[PDB]
């Protein structure tokens, strides 16, 4: 179940958490704020992240990815798989 | 969820099996001896192995991995995901 | 992992093996003080 | 006996901090010790 959904930064951020595991590649959604932006755009825990603003972060460091996400200002658009 | 746990070889090995699949990368736990070392350290079937003694074996042959496991003597420490 | 750490710990440790003072922390302190002041 | 524990304490403290300065840090740290 791939989801392409765009987020618009709320009072709380996009209202979710990125999470990576130590020594596994890949970065994934952990905690989705109820009613928060991530949630209403459909995201769910453990959805795995593929594209940030149309870029493929599969092979990129959790750090680089988080950064990529903040770097987009009011919005950021994600492609995930869950 | 990830588990880092160290195992100390028992009367019958660490009491578990390594299993791989025939042209899939990755190596995983399958048969955990009830009450055996692997079991008490928290392992469960199908936990996927990430590090042996601090080394990531994700990109390493099942053979290479089994060998690295035996090569540690009394003990081996494993990072898995399950 | 840090960049140039292994060399530091190595220097110190090899100095512990050549001495083995019954006291370590004092020794470490003193040894790194000797270090910086060297630098 | 007991070396690994010492280096480990220090090292783990390095990882939690990463000061742009180490020998000052080492000195200071062990003095603290």
């Amino acid at each position: 179940k791939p989801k392409l959904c765009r987020l618009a930064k709320g009072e709380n951020g996009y209202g979710f958490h990125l999470n990576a595991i130590r020594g596994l590649p890949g970065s994934f959604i952990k905690e989705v704020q109820k009613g928060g932006p991530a949630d209403l755009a459909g995201l769910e825990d453990e959805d795995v992240i593929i594209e940030v603003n149309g870029v493929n972060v599969l092979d990129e460091p959790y750090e680089k990815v988080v950064d990529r996400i903040q770097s987009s200002g009011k919005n950021v658009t994600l492609l995930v798989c869950g | 969820k990830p588990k880092l746990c160290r195992l100390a070889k028992g009367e019958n090995g660490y009491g578990f099996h390594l299993n791989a699949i025939r042209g899939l990368p990755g190596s995983f736990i399958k048969e955990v001896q009830k009450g055996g070392p692997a079991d008490l350290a928290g392992l469960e079937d199908e936990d996927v192995i990430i590090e042996v003694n601090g080394v990531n074996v994700l990109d390493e042959p099942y053979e290479k991995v089994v060998d690295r496991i035996q090569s540690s003597g009394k003990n081996v420490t494993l990072l898995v995901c399950g | 992992i840090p960049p140039g750490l292994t060399e530091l710990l190595q220097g110190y440790t090899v100095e512990v093996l050549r001495q083995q003072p019954p006291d370590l922390v004092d020794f470490a302190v003193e040894y790194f003080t000797r270090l910086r002041e060297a630098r | 006996p007991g070396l690994t524990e010492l280096l480990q304490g220090y090292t783990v403290e390095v990882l939690r901090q990463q000061p742009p300065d180490l020998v000052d840090f080492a000195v200071e740290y062990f003095t603290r010790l």
Partner: peptide, 23 residues
Amino acid sequence: KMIVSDVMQQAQYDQPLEKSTKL
């Protein structure tokens, strides 16, 4: 060396085991 390196892996494995950043 044996000592030092074994120290190191002992440290890394001292966590953290995961990374979450509130976004």
